[PDB]
């Protein structure tokens, strides 16, 4: 279930020499993939200079009524991201914003964090280690959020070789954190990156099965929405490991989101991973390096090794309290360093996780932390909400809220 390598630099030299032999024309393949990424980069910059946003936008009512056309789905799968509006009523989402604020003010969350290490003393928090607020629990179990997540999961190819790699019609809940960012606040440093593994995409054999069409030279056949092999990838044991397989990451806007307001940026290129994988196999890269990728860190995309992709960094469309935005698990994303806007940028991290044997194993340990009010196993054991006034319990759960947490009822 996990990857174990003692000497990583030596393994990189061995694997790169192994990949270069199986693909002796690795430079010819890269310059053709670069041509496919270049035209997408230029198409993205055409829209931004024109007044449009390259991130596709949909309304939740269109999804629920079944009005999404096949061309809208093809644009989501090519961009690898989607902003979905009106998932929750704006009146409730704006109230959810002030409920979490009162939830933190009531239990004195600021002083608790300080009282709970010099490096811990440094860490004005903007990402909050709370997981069981009433707005968080209620939004995960909303029927409109569930229908949206079912639609996103049905964009994937779930079946191959007589095997259903996940259930796109069943949804599980992955408890995550929340973000509250005020204007003129300090940057976090979330440079363009990809979550879910870094050098493991080259070293682990299960990862190379997902990207087998890239390493074989037939890059045109690589589908970022093919589920085969993705729940079986191995990562290094690190705090940056998500125990669940998420088809789409995403959050819900508690406050209006604006450009140059310290909010999310994305590179809307679904197959950008093909460019990154073949980039590290070129000759201007040292034999022991995979373009700065490090174990235990998110796969970084920089101006030094990927100047073409940096040109396509696009802000997300303007959102209101109640709109959501999702992006593929291989999509490069980042957060604006400065918040020069007026309204704060508060979001709730709520991804889209389908049912599979891998995700089902995480539910019992996740539910145990909910009943206790502790932190989920994938996060630092802060256990802030153990004695919190107003913490959401099982009494706050609906029938959908219990089926998605593994509760049998």
| Binding-site ranges for Mn ion (CB under 5 A) | 195
Residue 251, contacted partner among Mn ion, ligand AKG, none, CB below 5-8 A by kind:
ligand AKG
At residue 369's C-alpha, the angle toward residues 368 and 372, to 5°, is 90
Q: Give the shortest CB-187-to-ligand AKG separation in angstroms.
A: 12
335 binds ligand AKG (CB under 6 A): yes
318 binds ligand AKG (CB under 6 A): no
- HSE of 239 in the Cβ direction (CA atoms, 13 Å)? 3
Residue 206 CB burial class (10 angstroms; 0-12, 13-18, ≥19): middle
Please say which residue, 300 or 366, places its beta carbon nearer to Mn ion.
300
Residue 16, contacted partner among Mn ion, ligand AKG, none, CB below 5-8 A by kind:
none
Task: Identify whether the C-beta of residue 227 lies closer than 8 Å to the C-beta of residue 157.
Answer: yes
226 binds ligand AKG (CB under 6 A): no
Which residues are CB-neighbours of 346 under 8 A, at least 6 positions away?
Answer: 97, 100, 178, 179, 180, 181, 253, 254, 255
**406 Rama sector, left if φ>0, alpha if ψ -120 to 50, beta otherwise:** left
Binding-residue total with ligand AKG (CB under 6 A): 10
Count CB neighbours of 382 within 10 A: 16
Among 19, 145, 347, 350, binds ligand AKG (CB under 6 A): 347
253 binds ligand AKG (CB under 6 A): no
Please say which residue, 217 or 256, places its beta carbon nearer to ligand AKG.
256
267 binds ligand AKG (CB under 6 A): no
Q: Give the shortest CB-193-to-Mn ion separation in angstroms.
A: 6
> How many angstroms separate the CA atoms of 46 and 30, rounded?
24
151 binds ligand AKG (CB under 6 A): no
251 binds ligand AKG (CB under 6 A): yes
Residue nearest to Mn ion (CB): 195
249 binds ligand AKG (CB under 6 A): yes
Q: Give the shortest CB-264-to-Mn ion separation in angstroms.
A: 9
Distance from CA of residue 310 to its chain's centroid? 18
Please say which residue, 19 or 316, places its beta carbon nearer to ligand AKG.
316
- HSE of 9 in the Cβ direction (CA atoms, 13 Å)? 4
Which SS3 state, helix, strand or coil, does residue 63 take?
helix
Residues in the chain: 409
Distance from CA of residue 311 to its chain's centroid? 21
241 binds ligand AKG (CB under 6 A): no
Residues making contact with ligand AKG (CB under 6 A): 179, 190, 195, 249, 251, 264, 333, 335, 347, 349
């Amino acid at each position: 279930a996990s990857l174990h390598i003692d000497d990583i630099p030596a393994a990189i030299k061995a694997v790169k020499q192994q990949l270069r032999q199986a693909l002796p024309d690795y430079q010819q393949v890269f310059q053709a993939v670069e041509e496919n990424i270049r035209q997408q980069v230029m198409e993205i910059r055409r829209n931004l200079a024109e007044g449009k946003n390259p991130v596709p936008q949909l309304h939740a009512d269109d999804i629920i009524n079944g009005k999404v056309t096949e061309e809208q789905k093809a644009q989501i799968k090519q961009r690898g991201c989607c902003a979905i509006l009106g998932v929750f009523p704006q009146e409730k989402a704006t109230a959810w914003n002030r409920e979490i604020g009162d939830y933190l003010d009531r239990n004195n969350f600021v002083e608790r964090l300080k009282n709970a290490n010099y490096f811990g003393t440094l860490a004005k928090p903007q990402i909050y280690g709370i997981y069981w607020s009433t707005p968080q629990v209620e939004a995960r179990q909303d029927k409109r959020m569930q229908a949206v997540q079912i639609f996103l999961n049905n964009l994937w190819q779930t079946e191959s070789n007589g095997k259903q790699h996940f259930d796109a019609n069943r949804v599980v809940t992955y408890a995550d954190r929340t973000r509250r960012r005020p204007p003129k606040s300090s940057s976090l440093g979330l440079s363009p990156h990809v979550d879910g593994g870094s050098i493991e995409r080259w070293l682990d054999e299960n990862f190379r099965h997902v990207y087998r069409h890239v390493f074989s030279g037939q890059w045109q056949k690589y589908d970022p929405f093919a589920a085969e092999g993705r729940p079986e990838v191995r990562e290094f044991p690190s705090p940056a490991v998500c125990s669940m397989f998420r088809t789409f990451q995403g959050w819900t806007a508690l406050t209006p989101q604006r450009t140059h307001a310290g909010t999310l940026n994305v590179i809307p290129i679904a197959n950008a991973m093909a460019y990154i994988l073949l980039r590290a196999l070129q000759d201007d890269v040292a034999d022991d390096d995979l373009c700065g990728a490090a174990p235990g860190r998110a796969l970084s995309a920089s101006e030094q090794w990927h100047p073409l992709l940096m040109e396509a960094i696009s802000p997300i469309p303007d959102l209101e309290a109640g709109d959501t935005v999702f992006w593929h698990c291989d999509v490069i994303h980042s957060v604006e360093n400065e918040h020069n806007g007026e309204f704060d940028s508060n979001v709730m991290y709520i991804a889209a996780a389908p049912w599979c044997e891998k995700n089902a194993a995480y539910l019992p340990r996740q539910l145990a932390s909910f009943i206790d009010g502790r932190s989920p196993p994938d996060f630092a054991a802060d256990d802030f909400e153990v004695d919190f006034i107003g913490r959401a319990t099982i009494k706050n759960l609906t029938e959908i809220g219990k089926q998605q947490l593994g509760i049998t009822d």
